[PDB]
Structure 1
Amino acid sequence: GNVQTSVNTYNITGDGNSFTPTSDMTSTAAPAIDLKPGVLN
């Protein structure tokens, strides 16, 4: 967790972070991208 500083806009051990799940926003990237023949073109 050693301080970095600019590489990325947020420090991990940074001031006032906060792990806190909300039933409201179910974390998700993009897995189901459609590529099948008919659907991709």
Structure 2
Amino acid sequence: GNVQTSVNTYNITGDGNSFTPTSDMTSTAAPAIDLKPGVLN
């Protein structure tokens, strides 16, 4: 967790972070991208 500083806009051990799940926003990237023949073109 050693301080970095600019590489990325947020420090991990940074001031006032906060792990806190909300039933409201179910974390998700993009897995189901459609590529099948008919659907991709």
Normalised TM-score (structure 2): 1.00
Q: Runs of 4+ in structure 1 displaced over 2 angstroms?
A: none
The two structures, once aligned, show a CA RMSD in angstroms of 0.0
**Cα shift readout 1:1-41 (whole Å, capped 9, x = no counterpart):** 00000000000000000000000000000000000000000
Percentage of identical aligned residues: 100
Normalised TM-score (structure 1): 1.00
How many residues matched? Answer: 41
Unaligned runs of 5+ in 1: none
More strand by share: 2
